[PDB]
């Protein structure tokens, strides 16, 4: 799947537009994790 460019089905654990390439998903996934990291940083230092 990676060499052909299609996103592996074991990584799509959230809704994505139909026909997204793996490169776009990887960039989108990185941004989502960065938001989660910022949320985790704020929650750890600052409470709820």
């Amino acid at each position: 799947e990676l060499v052909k460019g299609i996103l592996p089905r074991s990584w799509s654990h959230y809704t994505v537009p139909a026909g997204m390439t793996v490169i776009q998903w990887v960039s989108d996934f990185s941004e989502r994790i960065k938001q989660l990291q910022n949320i985790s940083l704020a929650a750890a230092s600052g409470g709820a």
Partner: protein, 32 residues
């Protein structure tokens, strides 16, 4: 072959762009 080398670079670049560790939230009595 050639596909091994180009995929190795692509996977290595992806590992760099993708963040490494994501820390879990700490549960507290008022947090829950």
């Amino acid at each position: 072959p050639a596909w091994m080398r180009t995929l190795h670079t692509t996977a290595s670049n992806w590992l760099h762009l993708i963040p490494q560790t994501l820390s879990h939230l700490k549960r507290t009595v008022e947090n829950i």
